[PDB]
Design an enzyme around this catalytic site. Structure first.
Site, PDB file in Angstrom:
ATOM      1  N   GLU B 172       1.307  -1.097  -0.202  1.00 17.37           N
ATOM      2  CA  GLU B 172      -0.012  -0.134  -0.218  1.00 17.37           C
ATOM      3  C   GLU B 172       0.600   1.133  -0.471  1.00 17.37           C
ATOM      4  OE1 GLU B 172      -2.347  -2.442  -0.074  1.00 17.37           O
ATOM      5  OE2 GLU B 172      -1.332  -2.874   2.305  1.00 17.37           O
ATOM      6  N   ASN B 256      -0.948  -7.418  -3.406  1.00 16.03           N
ATOM      7  CA  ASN B 256      -0.564  -6.793  -4.451  1.00 16.03           C
ATOM      8  C   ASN B 256      -0.525  -5.276  -5.221  1.00 16.03           C
ATOM      9  OD1 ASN B 256      -1.007  -5.186  -2.088  1.00 16.03           O
ATOM     10  ND2 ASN B 256      -1.666  -3.498  -3.549  1.00 16.03           N
ATOM     11  N   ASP B 299      -7.493  -5.919  -4.268  1.00 17.45           N
ATOM     12  CA  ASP B 299      -6.286  -5.789  -3.019  1.00 17.45           C
ATOM     13  C   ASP B 299      -6.232  -7.252  -2.713  1.00 17.45           C
ATOM     14  OD1 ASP B 299      -4.777  -4.954  -1.427  1.00 17.45           O
ATOM     15  OD2 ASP B 299      -6.292  -4.760   0.441  1.00 17.45           O
TER      16      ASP B 299
HETATM   17  O1  LIG Z   1       0.535  -5.071   1.068  1.00 19.14           O
HETATM   18  C1  LIG Z   1       1.504  -5.337   1.348  1.00 19.14           C
HETATM   19  O2  LIG Z   1       2.719  -4.984   2.045  1.00 19.14           O
HETATM   20  C2  LIG Z   1       0.684  -5.796   2.845  1.00 19.14           C
HETATM   21  C3  LIG Z   1       1.506  -5.697   4.573  1.00 19.14           C
HETATM   22  C4  LIG Z   1       0.315  -6.424   5.291  1.00 19.14           C
HETATM   23  C5  LIG Z   1       1.228  -6.540   7.233  1.00 19.14           C
HETATM   24  O3  LIG Z   1       2.485  -6.967   6.945  1.00 19.14           O
HETATM   25  O4  LIG Z   1       0.656  -6.907   7.861  1.00 19.14           O
HETATM   26  C6  LIG Z   1      -0.739  -6.819   5.553  1.00 19.14           C
HETATM   27  C7  LIG Z   1      -1.326  -6.322   4.043  1.00 19.14           C
HETATM   28  N1  LIG Z   1      -0.409  -6.011   3.162  1.00 19.14           N
HETATM   29  C8  LIG Z   1      -2.814  -7.063   4.067  1.00 19.14           C
HETATM   30  O5  LIG Z   1      -2.875  -6.529   2.637  1.00 19.14           O
HETATM   31  C9  LIG Z   1      -3.897  -7.130   4.481  1.00 19.14           C
HETATM   32  O6  LIG Z   1      -4.722  -8.002   4.405  1.00 19.14           O
HETATM   33  C10 LIG Z   1      -3.195  -7.491   6.079  1.00 19.14           C
HETATM   34  C11 LIG Z   1      -4.097  -8.248   7.118  1.00 19.14           C
HETATM   35  C12 LIG Z   1      -2.752  -8.181   7.815  1.00 19.14           C
HETATM   36  C13 LIG Z   1      -2.848  -8.167   9.729  1.00 19.14           C
HETATM   37  O7  LIG Z   1      -1.378  -8.452   9.955  1.00 19.14           O
HETATM   38  O8  LIG Z   1      -3.978  -8.671  10.201  1.00 19.14           O
HETATM   39  N2  LIG Z   1      -1.594  -7.588   7.762  1.00 19.14           N
HETATM   40  C14 LIG Z   1      -1.951  -7.143   6.642  1.00 19.14           C
HETATM   41 CE   LIG Z   2      -1.927  -5.563   0.944  1.00 19.35          CE
END
Ligand SMILES: O=C(O)c1cc(C(=O)O)c2c(n1)C(=O)C(=O)c1cc(C(=O)O)[nH]c1-2
Ligand SMILES: [Ce+3]
Ligand SMILES: O=C(O)c1cc(C(=O)O)c2c(n1)C(=O)C(=O)c1cc(C(=O)O)[nH]c1-2
Ligand SMILES: [Ce+3]
Lengths: 577, 577
Positions: B172, B256, B299
């Site tokens: 993101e 994504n 996403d």
């Molecule tokens: O695109 C990214 O780099 C990234 C990183 C992370 C993260 O590092 O926890 C999540 C997501 N995306 C994501 O899309 C998501 O659904 C998500 C849930 C969580 C969580 O720990 O509950 N981390 C992340």
């Molecule tokens: Ce993500």
């Protein structure tokens, strides 16, 4: 308060911090007892959402449990009908974060009060707040203390009649200790009773110390100080309050007389620091007062609880007040007049030979009285006292007391102190270590103590100070926690440990016991280490300077506290099956 | 790594996050089973000293348990010989606190790796650190990610041979997703494999996708993007890694493709975002890769675990890779080649009709593909996916999977995104709600799923999303936690709950089971709510804007999470007796 006088008699509830107005911390519940406590297991738990020291304990009123935390003082109401609970409401006050910088002894709070469909809380930054007990709606808020003058609030308020009684902290910040009474409905201040200064501010009734003029009188709030030193006079009021409705007196103790350099307070008793007060709740006027430690040179705050048992004295049932002071003496007074019935050490004491039966003053050992610019070594107990705030229990079945204690000594050197409002006003270098002048390998003990005989019945040596106020029950059990996270149940007759479990963080909470809506007995306690002895862990302090935390850092590291426990904030609730 | 290949077979230990290299999360221990689990009780607990989301789980290696926390990522070794434990050592890394401001989805960390007398940890601020397993002494550390470019690390590293494999977060934030391999003995970065860009950066072996060239090939890391949009191409690598030493391939998924406004990525598949990679551990070179979601507009990160079971496929024992994607499909691949064996929905899916058997591409429902400047409504699953990172388990006894799932949908409108280094690069407005296009009154489910049949066997509807990865055992049990704090044991054959207890905070930890030095079986799990769905609670966010947290705030308030749980950070350990 007529509701509380009724409710406190109910075995199934826990409506004020120390069970009842007498502060006995005793429960008549006996579902859990010496025969079956080995089968006790966790029923449920609840995170307070805070870290650092979690003192006091929850309240149970009706089917609702009320839970409180360390700063920022989150408050929760838990609906115990929801198998096992649900969060009914929560409240977090807005506070001035500057309060954290002027808290002496960790950001603790000793808990809530309940009365008249309302919950009352204090905040570190000096507020007294009333909440609707059933919805959590803020009803009123008042500023009682001023962080810019080094004042904080950590003590639990007490509701008596239509008044909420609120104290203050800052005996290390030159604060003028006092108790304020606030109207339960509006929050409007009714009176303010100081622990020093002119009689108009101290508030003395016409019969003040009538029977015991040797305990002091009119004018002593200024005359027992050099110059106007009373204006920085301490006598703060952060401990536990008690109340006898039949006598119409409430009771509490007061802190050290401000600066720790007694040289700057020399020439008089420094009244009414280190004092037991008995006051009329309608007016705040004192009926009697007894100063335990005149011209303190040890930081022996007098704020520990004033338990109100009726004991058989010289063959007759007598309304007593019992108090295990920081100074190491277990006091028994007649709670009508302040007459001293007995005073004997409940821990090892070497600063005094005895309390004189002639004049009710300590017979000091001069080599243990501190002074400016020269160290005094091997003083027992240390400034944390024979015990600190952690409250004792009394069983009316046995007539005995169950006391959490410290086993530590110190060196203490007075240093010239300069006053700057908002900054520390101490004036001492203090080094702390284990009991019997460093000979002991343990720093705490849990004891059974006979107050009139002045003797321990049994003792449990504990590696760390016991910073948890026990609950004692008709099941023959005392529950208490240790600073390395063990929650324990002991046989009150012998001190044998019958059950124990290691929880997530050191326990400095005072456990409770109550009946759920299911009519089952539960035992509840906070975990989350901190407070004064735990300050090295709560504030993540290094070992490099053992004098830091006014001695607390060195001794915690010596006892191995930082290797024994992490910070936390969790409520654990136990039951059979 | 030969030590880990040996150790992962031991029933009594738990030496990597998902039990073994195959990520099955399955234990052969059966002391606790369907006949006796009702007798399970808390044995001991340990506070991590941190708040907010506690993901992953502890490791047990020999007689030492290794524990980790949310930011600032405290690490503890607990000596399990000390009845029940003692803190053997602790380590807290020095970090740049700016990392907190660029964490998308709470300040979680998915945990430690062990190998060859060392503990390996990642930090939110982008470090990979090797510690001596027995003393906690720092051996080496490297800066792997840069918070000033919006990079963080939340994923658990994997040790394979003499390398520790470390990903990155920031899909993101326009980050270039990649995996680095660090020499476990020196910390030297041996190779760095990007998820996009030219072949020299992606790293392809000479036989890349030779059996399935339709899955993509050389040059696709740039040619499937408009212009140089791949330079902000996402494909981050924050999920779980797996390994088959017999095949000399490690496996993982990619995020994504950066901006959530697909219009700015129009023109191609945006490979290798949303991709399953199989790479050689020696060189980082890809042997095969399969993109699950070409030209993502939802996403649907591909990072979920790559379980490596051996399944009977059309009568033949086949080395499979099974993966429950955010996009809602349960993929079964041949792990030698990336052959797509099966793909069927494990939750309600409406963005695609099916995955084509002709070319392994989703057959899209055009009405549900998102677009710039126009809202697209009722998309299932939402961006949190059929499931998020919370890992599923596989039982080799039943041949079935036990999967924590989400039941949520969304509206999603593309918005033009502008890149500023260190700032978010999203470009979407997202409103989230319950499943079946907002018709449902529950937001999660725990299911038993047959991957080859593409069929749920049973389902337990859960009020909150199930954000806890189960451990399944030879006792016929699955253990998992709920986001309102219930830890549960279910009979894997019936899907009936046989035991449950309410803990202090929502559980987003993945439970483990092991044998203590006392030869007794224990089950351990973190409590401490947070992560993406829990962000309103972990970050104390108001309900005023339902679009906040990229939709997570709205849906968490609609589901009632802020009324159901407080923050925490506690390890709970259970056993019989
Ligand atoms: O695109 C990214 O780099 C990234 C990183 C992370 C993260 O590092 O926890 C999540 C997501 N995306 C994501 O899309 C998501 O659904 C998500 C849930 C969580 C969580 O720990 O509950 N981390 C992340
Ligand atoms: Ce993500
Ligand atoms: O003089 C004061 O105003 C004052 C306040 C407090 C407090 O508010 O916690 C403590 C003390 N003194 C004190 O002397 C001390 O022993 C102490 C221990 C603790 C604790 O909670 O562990 N508070 C305090
Ligand atoms: Ce004091």
């Amino acid at each position: 308060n007529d509701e509380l006088i009724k409710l406190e008699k109910e075995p199934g509830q826990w409506v004020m911090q120390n069970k009842n107005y007498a502060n006995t911390r005793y429960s008549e519940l006996n579902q859990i007892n010496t025969k079956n406590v080995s089968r006790l297991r966790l029923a449920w738990s609840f995170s307070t959402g805070a870290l650092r020291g979690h003192e006091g304990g929850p309240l149970v009123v009706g089917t609702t449990m009320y839970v409180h935390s360390a700063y920022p003082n989150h408050v929760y109401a838990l609906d115990l009908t929801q198998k096992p609970y649900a969060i009914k409401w929560q409240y977090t006050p807005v506070q001035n974060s500057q309060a954290v910088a002027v808290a002496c002894c960790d950001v603790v709070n000793r808990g809530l009060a309940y009365a008249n469909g309302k919950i009352f809380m204090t905040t570190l930054d000096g507020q007294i707040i009333a909440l609707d007990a059933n919805t959590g709606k803020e009803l009123w808020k008042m500023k009682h203390a001023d962080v810019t003058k080094g004042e904080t609030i950590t003590g639990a308020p007490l509701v008596v009649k239509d008044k909420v009684l609120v104290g203050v902290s800052g005996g290390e910040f030159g604060v003028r200790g006092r108790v304020g009474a606030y109207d339960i409905n509006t929050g409007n201040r009714v009176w303010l009773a100081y622990s020093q200064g002119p009689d108009e501010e101290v508030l003395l009734d016409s019969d003040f110390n009538k029977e015991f003029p040797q305990h002091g009188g009119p004018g002593d709030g200024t005359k027992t100080w050099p110059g106007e030193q009373w204006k920085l006079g301490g006598g703060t009021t952060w401990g536990w309050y008690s109340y006898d409705p039949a006598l119409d007196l409430f009771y509490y103790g007061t802190s050290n007389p401000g600066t720790w350099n007694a040289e700057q307070r020399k020439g008089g008793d420094n009244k009414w620091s280190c004092t037991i007060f008995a006051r009329r709740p309608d007016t705040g006027k004192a009926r009697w007062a007894y100063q335990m430690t005149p011209w303190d040179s040890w930081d022996y705050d007098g704020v520990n609880e004033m338990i109100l048992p009726d004991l058989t004295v010289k063959g007759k049932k007598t309304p007593c007040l019992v108090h295990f002071d920081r100074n190491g003496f277990g006091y028994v007074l007649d709670r009508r007049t302040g007459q001293l019935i007995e005073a004997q050490p409940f821990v090892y004491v070497n600063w005094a030979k005895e309390i004189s039966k002639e004049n009710d003053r300590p017979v000091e050992i001069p080599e243990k009285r501190t002074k400016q610019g020269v160290d005094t070594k091997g003083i027992c107990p240390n400034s944390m006292g024979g015990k600190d705030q952690q409250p004792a229990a009394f069983s009316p079945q046995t007539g005995l007391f169950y006391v959490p204690t410290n086993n530590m000594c110190m060196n203490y050197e007075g240093v010239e102190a300069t006053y700057t409002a908002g900054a520390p006003y101490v004036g001492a270098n203090v080094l702390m270590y284990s009991g019997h002048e460093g000979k002991d390998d343990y720093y705490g003990a849990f004891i059974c103590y006979d107050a009139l005989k002045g003797k321990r019945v049994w003792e449990i040596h504990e590696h760390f100070p016991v910073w948890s106020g026990p609950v004692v029950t008709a099941g023959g059990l005392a529950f208490y926690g240790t600073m390395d996270g063990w929650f324990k149940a002991v046989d009150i007759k012998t001190g044998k440990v019958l059950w124990q479990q290691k929880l997530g963080s050191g326990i400095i909470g005072n456990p409770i016991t109550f009946l759920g809506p299911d009519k089952k007995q539960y035992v509840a306690v906070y975990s989350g280490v901190g407070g004064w002895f735990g300050i090295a862990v709560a504030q993540n302090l290094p070992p490099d300077d053992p004098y830091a935390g006014l001695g607390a850092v060195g001794v915690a590291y010596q006892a191995g506290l930082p290797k024994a426990t992490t910070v936390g904030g969790e409520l654990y609730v136990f039951a059979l099956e």
